Amino acid sequence: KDGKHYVAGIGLSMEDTEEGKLSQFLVAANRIAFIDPANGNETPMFVAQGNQIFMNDVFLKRLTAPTITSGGNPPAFSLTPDGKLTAKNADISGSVNANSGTLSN
Amino acid sequence: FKGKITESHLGKELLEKVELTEDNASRLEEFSKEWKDASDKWNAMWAVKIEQTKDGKHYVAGIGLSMEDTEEGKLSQFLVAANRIAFIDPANGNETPMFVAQGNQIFMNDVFLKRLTAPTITSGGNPPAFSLTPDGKLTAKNADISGSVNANSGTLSN
Amino acid sequence: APAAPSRIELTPGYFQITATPHLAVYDPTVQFEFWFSEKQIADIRQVETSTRYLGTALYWIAASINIKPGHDYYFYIRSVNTVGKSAFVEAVGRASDDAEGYLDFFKGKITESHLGKELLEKVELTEDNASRLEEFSKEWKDASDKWNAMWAVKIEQTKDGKHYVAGIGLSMEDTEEGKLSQFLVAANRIAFIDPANGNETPMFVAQGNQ
C-alpha cells in the first residue's frame, strides 16, 4: 500500500541447535482472537493486539506482575513496584505487623 | 472486539455460514483465496473451516488468517473459533497443557507480566485467603508491612 | 414421614460437583432425590418445576462442561422412601479452582481424544537424522455412526535415537452430548507477534509451562 509492505502469517517449524531439535509455533498478525462458538457465542475470550492482551476470568497458579491496578483513573486498589499498596478499605482477620502507623482515629 | 470481528471478512466466513443441513452431514474444508473488493484493493484469507450437523443443529469450527483493507491501511487478523484451545509443550514427552481456553475461561500455569489491570483478584476458595474487589477492599489473613501504614481509621482488638 | 437430611456434603471437582447427604438418625431404607440449578429461586414450592432433575440415589455426582469454576451452583436435596417425600433443603456448591488440577484434567481429556494420540503418542520414524512433514485433513465415521473431522500438520524428527515431535491440529470429535471442537498446538515455543511498524518483539510467549 503506497510503497509500504504488510506481511502476516502462521508457521510451525522444527529447527536444529547444538542441543538438538527445537520446535516453534509462530503467529504474526495484528490481532489474534480466540472465540468459542458454543450455543452460538461470538464474544471472544482472548484478544491480543498491539502488545496488549484482553481476557475474561482467568485461573492461575502463580503470577509475577510488578504492577497491578484495579482500573480507572484514581484506581480503587493498586500494587506498584516500590511495594506500595493503595486501597480504600482493608479487613485482616489476623495481625498487621507494621514498622509505623499513621491513623486519624 | 466481537463487533470488530463481526465487521470483518472471516466473521461471516468461518461463522454465519450454514453449509450442510441434514443429520450426520460433515464437511471438511480448506481454502486459500485472494481477491479484489469493491474498494479496488486486495483482501486475502486462508482458512480451514470444518462443519458438522446433528439433530438439525450446526457445529462449525475453524482456523483462519486474513488481511483486509481498512480506511487507514491493511489489518491482519488471525482467528480460532473452537470450543477448546490448548497449548502443550512436548519437551521430554510432556502432555500437561500450559494454556487451555474454553468457555470464556483461560487456565494457565505460572505467568510473568509487566502490568496487570484486573478489578477482581481472588486466591481461590470458599472464603478466599486473600481477595481484592473493585470497591477497593483488601481482604487477607495477615499483613506484614516493612514501612508505614497510613490509614484514615483503624479498628484493632489488641 | 422421613425427616430432611441434617447435613449435605458437596465435594468439589474439576467441572464437577459431588453431593452426599447425612441424617442425624440413620436409616438405610431411604433414598435421596437430587435436583440441580444454576440460579437461586426465591420460592421453594416450584423447585421441582424450575430445577433440573439430577436423579435419585444415596449420593450423586454432576459432571458437565456447564458447571464452571469460581461460580456458585444450587442443589435441592430431599429424602424419599415408601412413605413419601420430605422437605426440600438447599445447598450451595462450587467446582475446584486449582489451575494445576484443571490443567491435569485437561491433559487427561486431551489424551482421551483423537488429536492427543495423533500429534503425540506416535513413534513414526526410527532411524537417526530422519525427518518428515505430514499435513492431512480427514473426516471419517466412527463405530457409533457419528462423524469426526480433523486437520493436522505434524513435524517429526529423530536424533541420536530419540523422537522430537510438534504439531498443529484442529478437529471436532463426538462425545456423549454430541460434537465437540478442539484446537491443539504442541510446540516448544508458542509466539504471538504484532508486525505493525516493523515490530518483532512478541506480545505473548508460551514455553516450558511459563
Author numbering:
A (entry chain J): 871 to 975
B (entry chain Z): 818 to 975
C (entry chain F): 713 to 922
Give the authors' words.
Bacteriophage lambda’s tip protein, gpJ, plays a crucial role when attaching to the cell surface. The gpJ protein, comprised of 1132 residues, is located at the bottom end of the lambda phage tail, serving as a key component of the lambda baseplate. The gpJ trimer not only seals the tail tip into a closed cone but also extends a central tail fiber, providing the means through which lambda phage directly interacts with its host. Genetic evidence has identified the E. coli receptor LamB (ecLamB) as the direct target interacting with gpJ during the phage’s attachment process.
Therefore, a high-resolution structure of the complex formed between the C-terminal truncation of gpJ, starting from residue 713 (referred to as gpJ713), and ssLamB in a detergent environment was determined. The structure elucidated the interaction between LamB and the lambda tail in further detail. RBD inserts four loops (L1-L4) into the extracellular lumen of LamB. The interaction surface is significant, with an area of 6195 Å2 buried, a PISA calculated energy of –4.9 kcal/mol, and further stabilized by 45 hydrogen bond interactions. Upon binding with LamB, the distance between the three protomers of RBDs on the bottom side increases from 1.8 nm to 3 nm. Correspondingly, the top of RBD narrows, with the top loops moving closer to the central axis. The β-sheet above the RBD moves inward, in unison with the loops. Nine new hydrogen bonds form between the second and third layers from the bottom of the β-sheet, reducing the interlayer distance and the distance to the RBD. In S. sonnei, D255 on loop EL6 contributes a hydrogen bond that stabilizes the conformation of loop EL9 through S384.
